[PDB]
Amino acid sequence: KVFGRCELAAAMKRHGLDNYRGYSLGNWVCAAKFESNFNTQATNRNTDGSTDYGILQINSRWWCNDGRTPGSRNLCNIPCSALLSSDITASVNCAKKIVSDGNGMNAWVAWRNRCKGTDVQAWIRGCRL
Ligand code: NA
């Protein structure tokens, strides 16, 4: 599923991401834009052999099982394929664990490089929330 911007904003807010660990909704929408272009089916191979899955490009190195990432963990206790669903529940639940791990949203390098310190409220502009 390719979400609309406000469509994803509504879904993330419903699932309790607005101000989760102090991060406003626009931070999460901005992260999803640059990680996945709002596409639930996005997959990208990392140089270390791990893969990033779904709207928030969650890494098989720590967070989900894809069976092809040696020495990796599955800390969200989910198959990485569950992070590609049109229903973002699994991605959101797993993102709550990632952002709680100590470095907040710096875990998403695209958030740090492209969203951090920017006018992230622009990403929820015009949305009926
Ligand atoms: Na894994």
Coordinates of C-alpha atoms and ligand atoms in Angstrom, one line a residue:
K1 CA 0.0 0.0 0.0
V2 CA 1.2 3.5 -0.9
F3 CA -0.3 5.8 1.9
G4 CA -1.3 9.3 1.3
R5 CA 0.5 11.8 3.6
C6 CA -2.6 12.6 5.8
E7 CA -3.8 9.0 5.5
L8 CA -0.5 7.8 7.1
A9 CA -0.6 10.7 9.7
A10 CA -4.2 9.5 10.8
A11 CA -3.0 5.8 11.0
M12 CA 0.1 6.6 13.0
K13 CA -1.9 8.9 15.4
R14 CA -4.6 6.2 15.9
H15 CA -1.8 3.7 16.8
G16 CA -0.4 6.2 19.5
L17 CA 2.8 7.5 17.7
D18 CA 1.9 11.2 18.1
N19 CA 4.3 12.4 20.9
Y20 CA 5.5 8.8 21.6
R21 CA 8.9 9.1 23.5
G22 CA 8.3 12.9 22.9
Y23 CA 8.3 12.7 19.1
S24 CA 5.5 14.8 17.4
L25 CA 3.5 13.2 14.6
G26 CA 5.3 15.2 11.9
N27 CA 8.7 13.5 12.9
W28 CA 7.1 10.1 12.2
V29 CA 5.5 11.1 8.9
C30 CA 8.8 12.8 7.8
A31 CA 10.7 9.6 8.7
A32 CA 8.3 7.4 6.8
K33 CA 8.5 9.8 3.7
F34 CA 12.3 9.5 3.4
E35 CA 12.5 5.8 4.6
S36 CA 9.7 4.4 2.3
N37 CA 8.0 7.2 0.3
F38 CA 4.9 6.0 2.4
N39 CA 5.1 2.5 0.6
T40 CA 4.4 -0.5 3.1
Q41 CA 6.1 -2.9 0.6
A42 CA 9.5 -1.0 0.5
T43 CA 12.6 -3.3 1.1
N44 CA 16.2 -2.2 0.9
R45 CA 19.4 -4.3 1.4
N46 CA 21.9 -2.9 3.8
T47 CA 25.7 -3.3 3.1
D48 CA 26.0 -5.6 6.3
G49 CA 23.6 -8.1 4.6
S50 CA 20.6 -7.1 6.7
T51 CA 17.4 -5.8 5.1
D52 CA 15.1 -2.9 6.0
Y53 CA 11.4 -3.5 5.7
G54 CA 8.2 -1.5 5.3
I55 CA 7.1 2.2 5.9
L56 CA 9.8 2.8 8.6
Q57 CA 12.5 0.5 7.1
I58 CA 12.9 -1.7 10.2
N59 CA 16.2 -3.6 10.1
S60 CA 16.4 -7.5 10.2
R61 CA 19.8 -7.0 12.1
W62 CA 18.0 -6.4 15.4
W63 CA 14.2 -6.2 15.0
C64 CA 12.5 -8.8 12.8
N65 CA 13.3 -12.3 11.4
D66 CA 13.9 -12.7 7.7
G67 CA 16.0 -16.0 8.0
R68 CA 18.9 -14.5 5.9
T69 CA 20.6 -12.2 8.4
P70 CA 23.3 -14.2 10.3
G71 CA 23.9 -13.4 14.0
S72 CA 20.9 -11.2 13.9
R73 CA 18.2 -10.7 16.6
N74 CA 14.3 -10.5 16.3
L75 CA 13.6 -8.1 19.2
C76 CA 10.0 -7.3 17.9
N77 CA 9.3 -11.1 17.7
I78 CA 7.9 -10.8 14.1
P79 CA 8.7 -12.1 10.6
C80 CA 10.0 -9.1 8.6
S81 CA 7.3 -9.9 6.0
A82 CA 4.7 -8.7 8.6
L83 CA 6.3 -5.2 8.3
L84 CA 5.1 -5.0 4.6
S85 CA 1.3 -5.3 5.3
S86 CA -1.2 -2.6 4.3
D87 CA -2.1 -2.6 8.1
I88 CA 0.8 -0.7 9.8
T89 CA 0.1 -2.1 13.4
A90 CA 3.2 -4.4 13.4
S91 CA 5.5 -1.6 12.0
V92 CA 4.2 0.8 14.7
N93 CA 4.5 -1.7 17.6
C94 CA 8.1 -2.5 16.5
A95 CA 9.0 1.3 15.9
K96 CA 7.8 2.0 19.6
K97 CA 10.5 -0.6 20.7
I98 CA 13.2 0.9 18.4
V99 CA 12.6 4.5 19.5
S100 CA 12.7 3.4 23.2
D101 CA 16.2 1.7 22.8
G102 CA 18.2 4.8 24.0
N103 CA 18.9 7.0 20.9
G104 CA 15.3 8.0 20.1
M105 CA 14.7 8.7 16.5
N106 CA 18.5 8.8 15.6
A107 CA 18.0 5.0 15.1
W108 CA 16.5 6.1 11.6
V109 CA 19.6 7.6 9.8
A110 CA 17.1 9.2 7.3
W111 CA 15.3 10.9 10.2
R112 CA 18.6 12.2 11.6
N113 CA 19.9 13.5 8.2
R114 CA 16.6 14.8 6.7
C115 CA 14.0 15.5 9.4
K116 CA 15.8 16.3 12.7
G117 CA 15.7 20.0 13.5
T118 CA 13.5 20.8 10.4
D119 CA 9.9 22.2 10.4
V120 CA 8.4 18.6 10.7
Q121 CA 4.9 20.1 11.5
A122 CA 4.7 20.8 7.7
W123 CA 4.2 17.1 7.2
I124 CA 0.8 17.1 9.0
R125 CA -0.3 20.5 7.4
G126 CA -3.8 20.4 5.9
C127 CA -4.6 17.0 7.7
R128 CA -7.9 16.6 9.5
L129 CA -6.6 14.9 12.8
Ligands
NA1 NA 16.8 -10.8 12.5

